[PDB]
TrEMBL record, chain A:
Tree of life domain: Eukaryota
Listed name of the protein: pyridoxal kinase
Organism the protein comes from: Entamoeba histolytica (strain ATCC 30459 / HM-1:IMSS / ABRM)
GO molecular function ontology, one term from the record: pyridoxal kinase activity
Pfam families: Phos_pyr_kin
UniProt keywords, alphabetically: ATP-binding, Kinase, Metal-binding, Nucleotide-binding, Transferase
């Protein structure tokens, strides 16, 4: 028993976003992980009403200090960040990422959670701070809206997404997975590399299951991470993750929540249902 | 797609106690549940340093109100409480439990977490408030220390445990599962009923860590939810728990993630003895 993953993201008491998605997925894959919360909310922000508060910086610091002093994060090989309610937590997380990476190799997946479908669901201060946090990541997983924000470019096509990714690669980010780009009633995912000598950029086209969930992206992030941790090459890890996500969505009745509890037995599916098209 | 369980208890970022045990176990049984936290701590209280804070009453209220107004608790059939850092949250929970039960049938398992091995690990104000909370429960799961604290009786034997249970049954509590009693060099679990006309008290002799009890609570609850009679549910839960403990290296944390495939174990290893 040693902790392999540290993941810093939101929590909801009911339903499935952020670190609650993280918990279900990483538990099911039996990947021992630390789940540091950035919120304690009743439910996600889609509902008629929300209750609860974001985690305060002093408490976050107290937690991260406790993990370090008790050696509970000594053996972490992977780091994830997701939703932050305030920029002070983002900047503190940067400080912690720097320290974590200072004496060991840690693969940091930053899911730059800011909004979806053209619209932000984060504070404007958080957006700016996120432009700094992503610079420290090994891989980032923006949706098109998040990419557009992070770069100031429009992202309404694969061609546009490639141009925007390039801005971020120039800042040093090695790998960018753009998780949803709208094309007709298909969604396109793009995996873009800074080093296109030794890696090939690719896309995956999938049909749209007419939907809603922010838990969609969050679920994708953790399934993808799990397979990366299990040693599956990235192309294949992405194909598994999106494939499993599509199975989840077909098995989802409402649009309030992704049906992730009931699909736990299917989370480790190895089906790679889609075609990887290189650029 | 509806929440069946509401569980209100502690949270740790690393390791397994309280609602974190609750999540792993209820998730693995695919029982859709609401997990309201009462703390957000780095790690359990076994370590020299315990970063993070207890949940504040205002936030707790805001959470509970949101669940209610969004109808996310409308279809709850089971309620669990565990650890509370402060009595204000206990008294608010009592308000919530009264409302939930006044207009629907909800089975409330109260794990009256106060302490273990003679010693409290809760604030004194929490003890007093817990004596009130338990009065609303359908079943309570004290250990012998907790039972002794809740009644003022010594609990060093089954016969003593029965006398203590009787105090609490007279307050209305229907079922009391006393989870460990040190009788000589035996460890005995007792299930005592207020209604001994329609139910038979029993004991289970069992062989001799931080989230052990919490794991029992949730496996037990899961089998009750799956429709297993209480005697069998208890035997399964203690059988599975011990499997987890026996396959745990060292004592800092229970090996619950590696044991996920065994959480739905149906072995009933021990002997039920009616008393
Ligand atoms: Mg997202
Ligand atoms: Mg206990």
């Amino acid at each position: 028993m040693t902790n392999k993953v540290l993941t810093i993201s939101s929590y909801v008491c009911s339903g499935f976003v952020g670190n609650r998605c993280g918990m279900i997925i990483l538990d099911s894959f039996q990947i021992q992980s630390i789940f540091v919360l950035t919120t304690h909310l009743a439910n996600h922000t889609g509902y008629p009403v929300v209750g609860g508060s974001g985690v305060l910086l002093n408490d976050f610091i107290s937690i991260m200090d406790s993990l370090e002093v008790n050696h509970l994060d000594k053996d972490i090989e992977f780091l994830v960040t997701g939703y932050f309610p305030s920029s002070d937590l983002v900047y503190e997380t940067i400080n912690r990422v720097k320290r974590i990476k200072d004496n060991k190799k840690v693969y940091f997946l930053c899911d730059p959670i800011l909004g979806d479908n053209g619209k932000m669901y984060t504070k404007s201060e958080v957006q700016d701070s996120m432009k700094e946090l992503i610079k420290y990541a090994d891989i980032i997983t923006p949706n098109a809206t998040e990419l557009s924000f992070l770069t100031g470019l429009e992202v309404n096509s694969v061609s546009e997404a490639i141009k925007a990714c390039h801005i971020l690669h120039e800042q040093g980010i090695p790998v960018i997975l753009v998780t949803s780009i709208k094309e007709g009633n298909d969604i396109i995912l793009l995996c873009s590399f800074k080093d296109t000598l030794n890696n090939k950029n690719f896309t995956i086209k999938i049909p749209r299951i007419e939907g809603d969930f922010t838990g969609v992206g969050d679920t994708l992030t953790y399934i993808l991470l799990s397979w990366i941790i299990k040693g599956i090459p990235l192309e294949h890890a992405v194909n598994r993750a999106i494939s499993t996500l599509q199975t989840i969505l077909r098995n989802t009745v409402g649009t309030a929540e992704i049906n992730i509890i009931n699909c736990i037995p299917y989370l480790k599916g190895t089906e790679e249902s889609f075609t990887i098209t290189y650029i």
